[PDB]
Structure 1
Amino acid sequence: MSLTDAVAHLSPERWEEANRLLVRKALAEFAHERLFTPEPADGQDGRYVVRSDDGLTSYRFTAVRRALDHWQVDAGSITRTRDGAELPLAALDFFIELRHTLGLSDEILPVYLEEISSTLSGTCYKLTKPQVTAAGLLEGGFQALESGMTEGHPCFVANNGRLGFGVDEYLAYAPETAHPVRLVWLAAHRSRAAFTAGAGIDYASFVRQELGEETVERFDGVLRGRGLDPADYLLIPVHPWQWWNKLSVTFAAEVARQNLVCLGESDDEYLAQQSIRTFFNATHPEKHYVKTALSVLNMGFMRGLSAAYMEATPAINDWLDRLIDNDPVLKSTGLSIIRERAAVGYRHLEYEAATDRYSPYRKMLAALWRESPVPALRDGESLTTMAALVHVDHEGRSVAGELIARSGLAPTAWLRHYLRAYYTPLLHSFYAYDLAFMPHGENTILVLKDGVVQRAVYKDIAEEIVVMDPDAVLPPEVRRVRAEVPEDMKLLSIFTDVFDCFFRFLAAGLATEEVLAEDDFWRTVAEVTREYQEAHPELDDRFRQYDLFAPEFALSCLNRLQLRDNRQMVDLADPSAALQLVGTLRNPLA
């Protein structure tokens, strides 16, 4: 693949830039989580300083403080000083010099640095991409936006590690390189593998729509060639990294015994979405997304897919589809989900016998399909990940910025359209149904027309939603998602997932962009809040129980999670135990 081209993106110039960007983000987000407390340096108003563990090295910087204990740290401003000499900005030396101040044990530190190095390299890659503007992105379309994204999750410092990719694999498989990928297809023996269909899915028809009859006959022929009966098998699509580095070695027994048969590559070409392991069908965008098991470490979790949980997945999706059709409060917000319509799972009996339930060895071979948001589009409508709204091009324009311009409306009017599609349905789900999501940039998609947010689309459902009412009534396979979550924390699904981690940045980007000041931003949030509350007094009891207008709420720290344990940020059985709450934040709705 050419040894030297592979590492061409790693030049001194781009590494210096990438390092400055990442340190500025480590200052902003670690001050926000109070891991350090910058002190006003010398006698300057906006100048602050942060010192190393020993206090001999000083990171001086200027910054602009904003709502929700935000720190707009100016990348250009940062310096590193020790014994009266400048030193170079180095993200690694940074985490090492602050290792006791941050939560970094001798056991976690070296791997964290791998994740830092890995993220920095991806910034070096993105810096070699042709610069595109906010206008250029929207002109490109849905996938130009997906791959155009550069930040990632805006809270996590080490957010694009992808530990397990070699540099060639990085270039092949990272979403931000937009290189086509062809899926590897397996035949899996039904003594180990299970196809779980959603409402109205037939297997023999599903795979023929999703591969074409000609490919289906060919796969069945590969089986017949080996003396095997296609009726004993089902199909599983696997990520090529999984098949070459993991399945073909760890599952060698299954392949050799013909519990698994390697069939070939897919004729359609897929592109990795921001979540890496999920694939949009580029050849045929009408067709399904494909989510895949990928035993690689990104942002606090390994990204294997539990075959156990695949059994429950299409049912949970079916039920929230039925829920949203049958509730005209939500139908009024155009809110929909792209249902995880089908799944497959391989149960490896030997590794089950050898592991516990929460073992990565059980999440190595599983896949789900997901509806496409495309054929649902009416004339004039477009797609975009909502993580675009906090993307700032090389000119200082946000996609939000360009969308507000292009719509022509007053900023607060455009915004009102956005939260009526995106934010309001969350409110109604919590209050009227006890239903929370994980609705950040990656998990949300917005329909656009004429520059204005027509409706929202949600995804990553079964894995992520919680129903916070152990006693509430549900169908059987849905009852998994219930949980006893502390009362004081029940509202963090809005406070931290929506305000501290998205609006905090959106409001603050539009403020520096001089498009909408923070006060006018948050006032609009309150006004669509009351607009929903007053329209439904039959829940005023819960309205007061869970007061979204309280003068303070808990500061839940996200990085602090990953510094504590960056292979499993939270136990999945008790997700509430691992949270780290360090003080409070002035609610901007006061």
Structure 2
Amino acid sequence: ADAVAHLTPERWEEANRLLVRKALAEFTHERLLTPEREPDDGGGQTYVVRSDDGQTAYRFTATVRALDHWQVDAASVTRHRDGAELPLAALDFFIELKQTLGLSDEILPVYLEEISSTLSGTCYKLTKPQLSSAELARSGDFQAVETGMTEGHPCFVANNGRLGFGIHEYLSYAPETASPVRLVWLAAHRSRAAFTAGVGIEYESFVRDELGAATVDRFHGVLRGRGLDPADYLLIPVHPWQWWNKLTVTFAAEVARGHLVCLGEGDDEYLAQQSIRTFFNASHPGKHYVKTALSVLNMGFMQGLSAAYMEATPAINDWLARLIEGDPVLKETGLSIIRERAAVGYRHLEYEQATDRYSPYRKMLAALWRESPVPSIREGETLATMASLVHQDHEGASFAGALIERSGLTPTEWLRHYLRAYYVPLLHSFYAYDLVYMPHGENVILVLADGVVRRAVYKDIAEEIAVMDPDAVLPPEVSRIAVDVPDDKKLLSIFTDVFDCFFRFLAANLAEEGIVTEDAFWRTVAEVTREYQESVPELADKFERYDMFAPEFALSCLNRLQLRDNRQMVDLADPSGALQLVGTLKNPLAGRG
């Protein structure tokens, strides 16, 4: 009973209301829905969306903001059929709108699971102590912020499925539980496992730094006790779910043959971060994060980690770190990365022979270590995921709002600092190097001082960065990041991932709360843009070619990807074949060049 105590009628009702509100907003944004304006209820501002069959009506109020952003009011949402009101039920919403939303017969039931799971997660979150944005901002507690996020991805509606976790596993492993996790360590035979080190890393010292000499010794003692030579093995940390549910079954042959040997649990307590299988070391915050392979489904992908990709991983991070260090614009912004410093991959030789390069069976056992940002900060400074800037607490108060307030700066001065730290590097990376990232909430950490963004740190590099120049000259080990993207889609890396998928929400949240107008938000973005471009006149040709101030850019729809295919939302053999562009949005930078 304890495990399901969060699942009560009142919390489920609230969870449903929240999710339907989001569904209406975001599926409207994506043009799957087209709400009809009704004539004036309380001076107007009321819409209706009808079911596929027209019999059920979802009515609501909304404020429509820039980038076709629908701020659907959660308390206004009502559902009617036959003159009568019905309860708001997310499952029924998806069934009723299944043809409208483009959910096929094959996908609908699995997507309903994902929705059920997301809703369950909201119920769990509703049980947590309900901290205001102001309290969270005053805590200075990096992990209170990390584990206190509630929305998840702001676009995807089915965003917290974590399908593969039973409820007990949810409670042990989901980031919002803040449950401490001990990693399981394996010894992997060197005929199948390879460790790759970044600049300045050496394996023996590395694992001793991370585990301590005592634990390494103990692990050696496990090996010796079974008649194995430690020299023949490399250490690999695994997510306990992966061990108990996958490696001990799927990779039973490896365990049995002694290709993999279970060494026990490491001592240190870790916290799952937003990405679920990346772990922060709570016992020793200055130690590395550990990113693990986790074969659970979330937001269109299994959370596996490719063994083959590990070999290039530290080298790519070294390349990028060195590039950042060398670039005066980037220096001025204060940008840094937390490097993926070391990685270990395991090649299951028989699954390899049985599969192609894209199979999830090749992504079941690998790990990387990413440096902590904690040692880099000074006293006075605190850390927060950038996802926090779009967080709203239980009363609707923006966490960015709370930072603004604590800073004592005007909203636009506060924004300027954030934009110089986070945004300008994206501009300059694009224009100077053809370099893009995946710079969403969870892949940026903010360094804060008295509520002000002093600098931003990027993470999740090797698997996300791209150089949009198929002829790029790059060190051989990093040349796999060069890609061929049509010229007319290159700038979507900013317009989609920054503007439509992050700023859309940030600017809406701030305006709705009365803190700063969309006008001034986007003015500030424009001013920062212009000031950057004026500072690098040698790139003026490029600034003209790829116009940040163009009147429109494509609407790239995110939910549509998942609704079309919620198991492999992107074909990795053809990743740009997934993109779903549906008309254009007016650029809020238009007319501000």
TM-score category (smaller protein): over 0.9
Determine if contact 1:41/1:60 at 8 Å carries over to the other structure.
no
Give 1:66's aligned residue: 65
Determine if contact 1:290/1:368 at 8 Å carries over to the other structure.
yes
Deviation at 1:394, TM superposition (A): 2.1
Give 2:177's aligned residue: 177
Instruction: Select 1:11's aligned residue among 8, 12, 21.
Output: 8
Give 2:29's aligned residue: 32
Deviations 1:551-579 (A, max 9, x none): 11100000000101111221224322211
Determine if contact 1:183/1:240 at 8 Å carries over to the other structure.
yes
Indicate yes or no: 2:205 matched with 1:239: no
CA distance in structure 2 between the aligned counterparts of 1:43 and 1:236, rounded to whole angstroms:
63
Deviations 1:470-510 (A, max 9, x none): 00100001111111101111011100000001100100100
Q: Any idea what SS the aligned residue of 2:94 has?
A: helix
Aligned residue type for 1:220: H
Give 2:585's aligned residue: 585
CA distance in structure 1 between the aligned counterparts of 2:385 and 2:369, rounded to whole angstroms:
19
Deviation at 1:395, TM superposition (A): 2.8
Give 2:511's aligned residue: 511
CA distance in structure 2 between the aligned counterparts of 1:563 and 1:343, rounded to whole angstroms:
34
Number of positions where the alignment pairs a residue of Structure 1 with one of Structure 2: 587
| Structure 1 stretches lacking a partner, 5+ long | none
Deviations 1:387-443 (A, max 9, x none): 011111123321111111111111111100110000000000000000011101011
CA distance in structure 2 between the aligned counterparts of 1:147 and 1:259, rounded to whole angstroms:
36
Give 2:290's aligned residue: 290
Give 1:427's aligned residue: 427
127-136 or 175-184: which moved more? 127-136
Q: Any idea what SS the aligned residue of 2:343 has?
A: strand
Question: What RMSD in Å do the two structures reach over aligned CA positions?
Answer: 0.8
TM alignment of 1:503-542, pairs within 5 A: 503-542=503-542
Give 2:104's aligned residue: 105
Give 1:118's aligned residue: 117
Deviation at 1:256, TM superposition (A): 0.5
16-25 or 82-91: which moved more? 82-91
397-406 or 333-342: which moved more? 397-406
Indicate yes or no: 2:455 matched with 1:458: no
Deviations 1:142-192 (A, max 9, x none): 000000000001000000000000000000000000010000000000000
Q: Any idea what SS the aligned residue of 1:180 has?
A: coil
Deviation at 1:379, TM superposition (A): 2.0
TM alignment of 1:27-176, pairs within 5 A: 27-44=24-41, 45-140=44-139, 141-176=141-176
CA distance in structure 1 between the aligned counterparts of 2:245 and 2:164, rounded to whole angstroms:
9
TM alignment of 1:133-532, pairs within 5 A: 133-140=132-139, 141-532=141-532
CA distance in structure 2 between the aligned counterparts of 1:256 and 1:574, rounded to whole angstroms:
37
CA distance in structure 2 between the aligned counterparts of 1:168 and 1:101, rounded to whole angstroms:
35
Aligned residue type for 1:52: S
177-186 or 137-146: which moved more? 137-146
Deviations 1:525-551 (A, max 9, x none): 100000001111111111111111011
CA distance in structure 1 between the aligned counterparts of 2:150 and 2:379, rounded to whole angstroms:
29
CA distance in structure 2 between the aligned counterparts of 1:382 and 1:132, rounded to whole angstroms:
18
CA distance in structure 2 between the aligned counterparts of 1:309 and 1:472, rounded to whole angstroms:
20
CA distance in structure 1 between the aligned counterparts of 2:280 and 2:359, rounded to whole angstroms:
28
CA distance in structure 2 between the aligned counterparts of 1:391 and 1:265, rounded to whole angstroms:
34
State TM-score, norm by structure 1.
0.99
Determine if contact 1:68/1:504 at 8 Å carries over to the other structure.
yes
Determine if contact 1:383/1:446 at 8 Å carries over to the other structure.
yes
Aligned residue type for 1:69: D
Deviation at 1:43, TM superposition (A): 4.4
CA distance in structure 2 between the aligned counterparts of 1:395 and 1:580, rounded to whole angstroms:
34
CA distance in structure 1 between the aligned counterparts of 2:204 and 2:457, rounded to whole angstroms:
29
CA distance in structure 1 between the aligned counterparts of 2:312 and 2:167, rounded to whole angstroms:
36
Deviations 1:297-326 (A, max 9, x none): 001111000000001100000000110111
CA distance in structure 2 between the aligned counterparts of 1:90 and 1:497, rounded to whole angstroms:
30
Deviation at 1:42, TM superposition (A): 4.0
